[PDB]
Design a protein around this ligand. Sequence first.
Ligand code: BCL
Ligand code: BCL
Ligand code: BCL
Ligand code: BPH
Ligand code: SPO
Ligand code: LDA
Ligand code: LDA
Ligand code: FE2
Lengths: 301, 281, 238
Amino acid sequence: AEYQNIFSQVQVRGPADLGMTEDVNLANRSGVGPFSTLLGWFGNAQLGPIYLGSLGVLSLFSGLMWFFTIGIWFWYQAGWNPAVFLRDLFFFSLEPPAPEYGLSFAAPLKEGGLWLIASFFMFVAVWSWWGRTYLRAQALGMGKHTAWAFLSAIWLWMVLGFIRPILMGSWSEAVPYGIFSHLDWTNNFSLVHGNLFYNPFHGLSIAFLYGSALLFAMHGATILAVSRFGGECELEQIADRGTAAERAALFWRWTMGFNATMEGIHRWAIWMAVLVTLTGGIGILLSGTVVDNWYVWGQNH
Amino acid sequence: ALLSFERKYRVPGGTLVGGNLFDFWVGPFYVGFFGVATFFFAALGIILIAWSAVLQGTWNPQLISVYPPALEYGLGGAPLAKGGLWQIITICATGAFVSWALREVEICRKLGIGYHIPFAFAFAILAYLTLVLFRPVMMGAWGYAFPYGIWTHLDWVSNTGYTYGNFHYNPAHMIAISFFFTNALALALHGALVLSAANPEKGKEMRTPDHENTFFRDLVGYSIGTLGIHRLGLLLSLSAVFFSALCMIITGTIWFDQWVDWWQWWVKLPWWANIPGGING
Amino acid sequence: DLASLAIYSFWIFLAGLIYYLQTENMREGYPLENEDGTPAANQGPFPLPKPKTFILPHGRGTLTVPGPESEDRPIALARTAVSEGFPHAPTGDPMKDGVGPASWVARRDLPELDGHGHNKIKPMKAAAGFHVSAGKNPIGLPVRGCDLEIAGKVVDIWVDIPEQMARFLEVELKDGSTRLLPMQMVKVQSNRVHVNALSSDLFAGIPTIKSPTEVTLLEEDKICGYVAGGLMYAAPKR
Ligand code: BCL
Ligand code: BCL
Ligand code: BCL
Ligand SMILES: CC[C@H]1c2cc3[nH]c4c(c3C)C(=O)[C@H](C(=O)OC)c4c3nc(cc4[nH]c(cc(n2)[C@@H]1C)c(C(C)=O)c4C)[C@@H](C)[C@@H]3CCC(=O)OC/C=C(\C)CCC[C@@H](C)CCC[C@@H](C)CCCC(C)C
Ligand SMILES: COC(C)(C)C/C=C/C(C)=C/C=C/C(C)=C/C=C/C(C)=C\C=C\C=C(C)\C=C\C=C(/C)CC/C=C(\C)CCC=C(C)C
Ligand SMILES: CCCCCCCCCCCC[N+](C)(C)[O-]
Ligand SMILES: CCCCCCCCCCCC[N+](C)(C)[O-]
Ligand SMILES: [Fe+2]
C-alpha cells in the first residue's frame, strides 16, 4: 500500500550537529557521540554531544550513589552470590526505618539507615537534575516549561518519600527500593486507606493518565497524517500556518466539533500530562493525613 | 459556521458509502453515512441505558448500572432486564465506535491526509472488545465482561484484579503500565519543548528546532527529532493499549492462578534454584 | 474537611484551565465565518483571547494572533445547495486551482532558515557532508506514477539539515525540468520510486520552485497540496 511514515525509507546523515551556542558554556559540552543507524530508522541517528557542568556531575554522582547503595544492599541479601543475585533480583528490597524510629536517623544501617542514605542521594540527584532542566533552557533563552512540567512529577515523588512520611511522623511510611516490594507497597497503601478507587484525586489522576495516552495517540497520529505537508515542522506552522495545520484542525473540527492550533495542542498536551502527577500527589498526600479511609470519606461527601 | 480557512476544504468526495447522499455538514460536524450510523447506534444505546435505569429504579448517574448476563447464561441470550439490555447496548457501542472510526476515514479521504488517526483509534476499540467480547467468549460467558456503570465498572476492575491476587504481578500488565507512564512522560516533555521554543524568555525571538535539538542533547545527550517524537508518542500510547488488551486476554484463560506465583518459573531455573541464600532460599 | 475543599477547589481550577486552553486554541481560524466569508452570528461561549506577538527568528518580523484573517488568494469553489452545510464544487480544475485536498495556504514566500541563518532545506548536492547513510538510495531511480507509467527520474534528495532527514525527492521530467515530491508520498523500491498520488501526466503540473537551490514555505505548500490532492483527483487514472 502507501508509506505510513512509521520508519524512514532512507536515512541521510551529515556532519555532526554541534548545536546552538547562545549563552551556553561550550567548555562543558562534550564531543559528539557515535551515530546509530538503528535509532535513525525511527528518529535522529546522532548521539550527543551532552552538557555536563558541575551541577550535572553532582546529579550523576548522586544518582549513581543512589543506585549503588541499593545495589550493594541487594548483593548483601544475595550473600554476594552472583547466581542468587540474578535469581532474586526482583525480590530484594532496601526498606525504610521501622515506625519505632519515627523521623530520626538513629536506625541501624541494615535496618533503615542505608535506606535513608540512598534516599538522600536520590534527593540530591533529582533536585540537581531539576536545576539542570531549568539552567539548560535558560542558557538557550528558552521558556522554562520543561522545568515546570518536571516539577509536577517531582511533586508526586516528594509526596511519596518525603512530604507524606514527614507529615505522618515516620520514615516507615515511605516507599522501599525494590521491584516487587514497591508494588506490594502500592497495593498495601490502597488496602490500608479504604480502596484508592474511592479517592477522587486518584480517579482524576487516572483520567489524565488515560487522557495522556488518548491525546498523544491523537496528536502523534495527526502529525504523521499531515507530515506529507510538513506538519511535523511545528514551530514553522505556529509562525506561519500551513495547509498541514489547517487540515489537522479540520480533521478534528469535522470529527468532534472543535479543534486546536499547532501551538495550542501542545498546551493541551503539557497540562494533560502534568495533571496526572499533580492530582496524584494531592490524592496521596491527603491519604492518612486527612483521610484514613476513602470509602468512608465518600459516604460523607 | 466555518473557521476562516475552512471553505476551500469543504468539497464533495471521499465517502466510502452512499456517494453524495450524506456528503454534508451539520454546523462543524461532518456527517457521511457513518455519521448517520454513529447517531443511530449511539441514540439507541443511550435509550436502552435509560430503560435499564427505569428497570433498575434510579435516575442517579452515579447509580445507573447495566450488567451483562449472569454466568449461568453462558454465551447465550438473556432477558432484557437480566443481561439482555447489556448485550444490545454492547452491540450498539461497538457499532457506534466502528462507525466513528469509519467516519474518520471518510474525513481523511476528503482532506487528503493519512489514515493514522482511525488506525490508532482502532486500538482503543480492540481493547474495549477484548474486555466485553474476546475475553468473555474465550472464558465461556458474557458475565465476565464489565458492567456499564460509573462506579460499578470500578468494582469490576477491583474484583477482577484481586481474583488473581495483586494484579501488579501480571507481566503483560507491568509492560502496559511502563508504556502508560513513559507515554505521559514523553507527552509532558513534547508539549514543554515545543512551548519553550515558541515562548522563549520575554523579548527574545522564537527559538528554532535547532534550539529544541540542542536543549535535549545538552540535557540527556539525545534528541529524537520532531518526526521521531510524534512517532514515539503514537507508539507508546498504542503499545500501552496493546499490552493492556494482552494482559487481560491471557488472564482467566491461559493463566488463572495467582499472578505472583507465575514468577516462580524464573526462580526455579535449574542452575540456581537450589543455591542457598537470597530471598528464595 | 481539607479533602472536600481540595477537590472542590480543583474543579474550579480545571474549569478555569479548560477556559484558558480553549481560548488559547482560538488564535487561528476565529472569528468563525459564514460560507460567504462574513462573520458568523454564533461565535460560541468562548471569547477571542488577547493578542500575543511572536518575534520571528533572524529579523523575519513578527506574528500577532489573533489577527486579521484572510485567504489572500482566490478560492475557485461554488455552492451546490441553497442552504448552508453542503459541499462546494470546484469551478475549474481543483488541482490547478488549489482547492479541496489539493489546497495550499498563502504562506510566506521565503525559505525557512535554521538557527544558524542558513536555509533549513537544501538539495543534498548542496548540503556539505550529507549523504545517504542507510536504506536504498533513491537517486538515479526511475519514478513511476499511479498509471504505471514512468514520469521521470530521481536526481536528488532534499534534506532538512537540522533534523538530518529527507523531506523531498527531486524528480527530473522528460522535458529536463524538475519537480519536488514529498518523501511521505513516495515509495522507494529496489528498482524504482512509486508515486500512488499522481499519474505520470500530472507530474508536469506539480508547482515549480522559482530558485533551483531552495524552496520557500509558499512553494512547499503548493507542492505538497498538489501531490496530496492527486489521491482524490487522479483516482480515474489510478
Ligand atoms: C480502562 C480499563 C477499565 C477502566 C478503569 C477505570 C478506572 C480505574 C477509572 C476509570 C475512570 C473513568 N472511566 Mg473507566 N475503565 C474501563 C472502561 C471504560 C469505558 C469503556 C467504554 O471502555 C468508558 C467509557 C470509561 C469511562 C470512564 C470515565 C467515567 C472515568 C474517566 C475516564 C477518562 O477520563 O478517560 C480518558 C478520556 C478522556 C479524558 C476523554 C473524555 C472522556 C469522557 C469523560 C468519558 C465520559 C463517559 C460517560 C460518563 C459514559 C457514557 C456517556 C453516555 C452513555 C453516552 N471506562 C475499563 C473497564 N476507569 C476513572 C473514574 O473516575 O471512575 C469513576 C477511574 O478512576
Ligand atoms: C492496589 C493498587 C491500588 C492503587 C494504588 C495507588 C497508589 C498508592 C498510588 C497510585 C497512583 C496512581 N495510580 Mg493507582 N491504584 C490502583 C488502581 C489503578 C488503576 C487501575 C486501572 O486499576 C490505574 C489506571 C491507576 C493509575 C494510577 C496513576 C494515575 C497514578 C500514578 C501517576 C504516575 O504517573 O506515577 C508515576 C510517576 C511518578 C512516581 C513520579 C516519579 C518522579 C521522579 C522524580 C522520578 C525519579 C527517577 C529516578 C531518579 C530513577 C531514574 C532511573 C533512570 C534509569 C534514569 N491505579 C489500585 C486501586 N495508585 C499514585 C497516585 O498519584 O495516587 C493518587 C500513587 O501514589
Ligand atoms: C485492584 C485492581 C488491580 C488492577 C486490575 C486491573 C484490571 C482487572 C484491568 C486493569 C487494566 C489496566 N490496568 Mg490495572 N490494576 C491494578 C493496578 C494498576 C496500576 C497501579 C498504579 O497500581 C496501574 C498504573 C494499572 C494500569 C492498568 C492499565 C494498563 C489498564 C487500563 C488501561 C486500558 O486498558 O485502557 C484500554 C482502553 C479502553 C478500554 C477504552 C475504550 C474506549 C472506547 C473505544 C471509546 C469510549 C467512547 C465513549 C463511550 C464516548 C463518551 C462520550 C463522549 C466523551 C462525548 N493498574 C490493581 C493491582 N487492571 C485493564 C486492562 O488491561 O484492560 C484491557 C483491566 O481490565
Ligand atoms: C488506543 C489508545 C488510546 C486512545 C486513542 C484514541 N481514542 C480516540 C481516538 C484515538 C486515536 C479517536 O480518534 C476518537 C476521538 O474522536 O477522540 C476525540 C477517540 C475517543 N476516545 C474516547 C474515549 C476514551 N478513550 C479512552 C482511551 C484511549 N483512546 C487510549 C488511551 C478512554 C479510556 C477509558 O481510557 C475513553 C473513555 C471517545 C471520547 C472518542 C471516541 C468517540 C466515539 O466513539 O463516539 C461514538 C459514540 C458515542 C458519542 C456514544 C456511545 C454511547 C453508547 C452507544 C455506548 C456506551 C455504553 C457503554 C460502553 C458506556 C460505559 C460507561 C461506564 C464504563 C462508565
Ligand atoms: C550488579 O551491579 C552493581 C552496580 C551493584 C549494580 C546493582 C544495583 C541494582 C540492582 C540496583 C536496583 C535499584 C532499584 C531496583 C531501585 C528501585 C526503586 C523503586 C522500584 C521505586 C522507588 C520509589 C521511591 C520513592 C517514592 C522515593 C522517594 C524519595 C524521596 C522523596 C527523598 C527522601 C529523602 C530523605 C528521607 C532523606 C532526608 C535527608 C536530609 C538531611 C535532607
Ligand atoms: C486538560 C484536561 C482536560 C481533562 C478533563 C478530564 C475530566 C475527566 C474527569 C474524570 C474523573 C472524575 N472523578 C473525580 C470522579 O474521578
Ligand atoms: C474533557 C474536557 C475537554 C473538552 C473541552 C471542550 C471545549 C468545547 C469547545 C467548544 C468551542 C466551539 N466553537 C466552535 C464554537 O468554538
Ligand atoms: Fe507536537
